[PDB]
Design an enzyme around this catalytic site. Structure first.
Site, short mmCIF file in Angstrom:
data_model
loop_
_atom_site.label_atom_id
_atom_site.label_comp_id
_atom_site.label_asym_id
_atom_site.label_seq_id
_atom_site.Cartn_x
_atom_site.Cartn_y
_atom_site.Cartn_z
N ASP A 57 53.23 112.13 66.72
CA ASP A 57 52.65 111.28 67.72
C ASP A 57 51.08 111.57 68.25
OD1 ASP A 57 53.82 109.07 69.75
OD2 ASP A 57 52.52 110.65 70.85
N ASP A 59 49.52 110.91 71.09
CA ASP A 59 49.17 111.34 72.35
C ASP A 59 49.93 111.97 73.03
OD1 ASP A 59 51.03 109.33 72.87
OD2 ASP A 59 49.53 107.62 73.47
N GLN A 61 52.79 110.92 74.17
CA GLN A 61 53.68 109.89 75.10
C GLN A 61 54.61 109.20 74.12
OE1 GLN A 61 51.19 107.54 78.06
NE2 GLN A 61 49.46 108.47 77.24
N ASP A 138 77.08 112.59 75.11
CA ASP A 138 78.52 113.14 74.35
C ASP A 138 78.49 113.23 72.72
OD1 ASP A 138 78.60 110.38 74.47
OD2 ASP A 138 80.45 110.43 75.57
N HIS A 142 79.02 116.15 70.60
CA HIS A 142 80.03 116.02 69.96
C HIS A 142 79.43 116.61 68.28
CE1 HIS A 142 83.36 113.56 67.85
NE2 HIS A 142 82.61 113.77 66.66
N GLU A 143 78.22 116.01 67.91
CA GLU A 143 77.90 116.25 66.61
C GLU A 143 77.55 117.52 66.28
OE1 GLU A 143 78.99 114.11 64.58
OE2 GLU A 143 78.88 112.10 65.49
N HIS A 146 80.10 120.10 65.61
CA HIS A 146 80.65 120.30 64.20
C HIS A 146 79.93 121.35 63.57
CE1 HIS A 146 83.30 117.09 63.87
NE2 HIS A 146 82.51 116.09 64.01
N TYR A 157 88.14 119.18 57.10
CA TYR A 157 87.93 117.87 57.75
C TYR A 157 88.86 116.97 56.71
CZ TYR A 157 85.53 114.24 60.30
OH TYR A 157 85.17 113.25 61.34
N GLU A 166 87.78 117.23 64.93
CA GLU A 166 87.16 115.87 65.91
C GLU A 166 87.42 116.31 67.45
OE1 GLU A 166 85.48 113.20 65.62
OE2 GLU A 166 85.15 113.74 63.67
N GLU A 177 78.40 116.73 78.49
CA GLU A 177 78.25 115.57 79.30
C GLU A 177 78.18 115.85 80.78
OE1 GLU A 177 79.53 111.50 78.25
OE2 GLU A 177 80.35 111.34 80.32
N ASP A 185 82.20 111.44 82.29
CA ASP A 185 83.39 110.91 82.31
C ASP A 185 84.10 111.69 81.07
OD1 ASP A 185 82.56 109.52 79.76
OD2 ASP A 185 81.71 108.42 81.13
N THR A 194 78.64 99.21 72.34
CA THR A 194 79.02 97.82 72.48
C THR A 194 78.19 97.37 73.90
OG1 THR A 194 81.23 97.91 73.79
CG2 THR A 194 81.23 97.37 71.45
N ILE A 197 79.66 94.84 76.19
CA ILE A 197 80.85 94.75 76.96
C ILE A 197 80.75 96.09 77.79
CG2 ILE A 197 83.20 95.47 76.46
CD1 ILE A 197 83.12 94.30 73.73
N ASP A 226 90.90 107.12 57.21
CA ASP A 226 90.14 108.18 58.06
C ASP A 226 90.58 109.61 57.73
OD1 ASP A 226 88.51 108.80 60.33
OD2 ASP A 226 90.25 108.49 61.65
N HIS A 231 90.16 111.10 63.59
CA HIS A 231 89.65 110.16 64.66
C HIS A 231 90.74 109.75 65.49
CE1 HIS A 231 85.85 110.22 62.08
NE2 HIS A 231 85.44 110.73 63.53
#
Ligand SMILES: CC[C@H](C)[C@H](N)C(=O)O
Ligand SMILES: CC[C@H](C)[C@H](N)C(=O)O
Ligand SMILES: [Ca+2]
Ligand SMILES: [Ca+2]
Ligand SMILES: [Ca+2]
Ligand SMILES: [Ca+2]
Length: 316
Positions: A57, A59, A61, A138, A142-143, A146, A157, A166, A177, A185, A194, A197, A226, A231
């Site tokens: 970058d 500047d 910013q 979170d 989470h990642e 791993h 896995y 997981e 978090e 939470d 979403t 929603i 899965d 998951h």
């Protein structure tokens, strides 16, 4: 790169301003030298070649729309590093201050984020299922968890070991978090899932069944989708962890809550001292009971609560 440590400012995915550790050498790079051997954030430029280019970058910013996912991936990696160092005395994911690398703008409309064995990778989402996934602390934690798992228990896995893998990531994603203490939470991904929603999330640890995931071993998925439901069946372990921390009565089994800090200590010890690549749910229960015994004593409330929680989710 070689340069001098600087402090830039920018806006994350949700429009919040934050300072970010950068490095100056002709350009200002998303390279934080204040943590371990560095936190480095890269632009994948809508492609799938990784890592892409270290974020440069002009500047210092970072208020452009294109910058927002990089701001948050970089900043939340720092928060996750701080959690592991300050709470668990763990220096980066390998315990030896390995550099933490993240790429943003991976592919086009990519509705996921992942640890690839070497680095963190974030899609931008399609704007309907997700907005850029690094906007969720979170998700980031989470990642990166791993990577911690890769260097410790090494849970394969697939099937039950994979569901534990997981859940460990959901558990520590949530504890990070809470550590940062902004709208914490027991839901997963609510900040980036979403945008049209309100009040939903991708998974719930307090009530996994709200999104169709099992909250009891008798409801476990046994099919092959899965990776054997990693998951899906994680909900059983997520519910046990929630009950250990917060308490409650679940399928008529009462659990005395012991709080988030003790949950984190018990599960971190289980992950780093007892779990193995092939651990199943029953072996996780035994690992958590032993970890709580090590930390608090065999006659402790903490040990009794661990047993109650696994009983409540049907894991013996
Ligand atoms: C849509 C992606 C879901 C939520 C999960 N991370 C798998 O992969
Ligand atoms: C933590 C959420 C992300 C998208 C994860 N890879 C699934 O689930
Ligand atoms: Ca700029
Ligand atoms: Ca939240
Ligand atoms: Ca959350
Ligand atoms: Ca939503």
């Amino acid at each position: 790169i070689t340069g001098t440590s600087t402090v830039g400012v920018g806006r994350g995915v949700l429009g919040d301003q934050k300072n970010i550790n950068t490095t100056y050498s002709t350009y200002y790079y998303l390279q934080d030298n204040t943590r371990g051997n560095g936190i480095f954030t890269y632009d994948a430029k809508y492609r799938t070649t990784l890592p892409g280019s270290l974020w440069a970058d002009a500047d210092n910013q970072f208020f452009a729309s294109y910058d927002a996912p990089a701001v948050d991936a970089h900043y939340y990696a720092g928060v996750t590093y701080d959690y592991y160092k300050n709470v668990h005395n763990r220096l980066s994911y390998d315990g030896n201050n390995a550099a933490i690398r993240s790429s943003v703008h991976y592919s086009q409309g990519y509705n996921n984020a992942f640890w690839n064995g070497s680095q963190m990778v974030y899609g931008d989402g399609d704007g309907q299922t997700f907005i850029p996934l690094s906007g969720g602390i979170d998700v980031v934690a989470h990642e990166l968890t791993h990577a911690v798992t890769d260097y410790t228990a090494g849970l394969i896995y697939q099937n039950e070991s994979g569901a534990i893998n997981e859940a460990i990531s959901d558990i520590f994603g949530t504890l990070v978090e809470f550590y940062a203490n902004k709208n914490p939470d027991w839901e997963i991904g609510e900040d980036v899932y979403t945008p049209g929603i309100s009040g939903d999330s991708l998974r719930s640890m307090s009530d996994p069944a709200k999104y169709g995931d099992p909250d009891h071993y008798s409801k476990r998925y046994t099919g092959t989708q899965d990776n054997g439901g990693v998951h899906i069946n994680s909900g059983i372990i997520n519910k046990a962890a929630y009950l250990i921390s917060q308490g409650g009565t679940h399928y008529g089994v009462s659990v005395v809550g012991i709080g988030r800090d003790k949950l984190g200590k018990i599960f971190y010890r289980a992950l780093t001292q007892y779990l193995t690549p092939t651990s199943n749910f029953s072996q996780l229960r035994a690992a958590a009971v032993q970890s709580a015994t090590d930390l608090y004593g065999s006659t402790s409330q903490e040990v009794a609560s661990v047993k109650q929680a696994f009983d409540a989710v049907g894991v013996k």
